[PDB]
């Protein structure tokens, strides 16, 4: 698989004609007019999918997120950082060759769901 063929797969899975990318392969999908999930290669073998969500609500969330920030054997796990303004930055890091259009679409929907809470298709 290549990065660009993976994006083609992902567009097809979502029912878009194309996920355009800039010079460095940075692409984006806008969700319900307001949220944006960004896609980019980060090294030779891996890409990320990520979004800025809302401001942290309180100390309670930081514990909740950290209690869940544990290693996993799964792929497409959603992780959470804070930006300099205490907004959540939600992200997943994936192997280009190991992932599919379907898993990327699951990542996208999981990213969006977290934000709110805070080859043929395999769907």
């Amino acid at each position: 698989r290549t990065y660009s063929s993976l994006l083609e797969e992902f567009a097809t899975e979502l029912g878009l004609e194309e996920i355009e990318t800039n010079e460095l392969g940075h692409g984006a999908v806008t969700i319900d007019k307001i949220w944006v999930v960004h896609l980019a290669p980060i090294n030779e073998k891996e890409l990320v999918a990520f979004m800025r969500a809302g401001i942290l609500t309180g100390q309670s969330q930081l514990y909740d997120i950290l209690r869940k920030n544990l290693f996993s054997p799964l792929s497409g796990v959603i992780r959470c950082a804070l930006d300099k303004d205490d907004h959540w930055l939600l992200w997943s890091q994936l192997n280009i060759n190991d992932t599919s259009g379907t898993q990327l679409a699951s990542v996208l929907t999981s990213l969006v769901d977290k934000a709110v809470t805070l080859r043929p298709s395999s769907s």
Partner: peptide, 28 residues
């Protein structure tokens, strides 16, 4: 633009969001 699992989705983003992404990606 289409509908996917209850979400309205389109390729693209407002420029400020692309700027934000460029910032995050340039600091890793």
């Amino acid at each position: 633009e289409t509908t996917f699992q209850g979400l309205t989705i389109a390729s693209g983003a407002r420029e400020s969001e692309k700027v934000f992404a460029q910032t995050v990606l340039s600091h890793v």
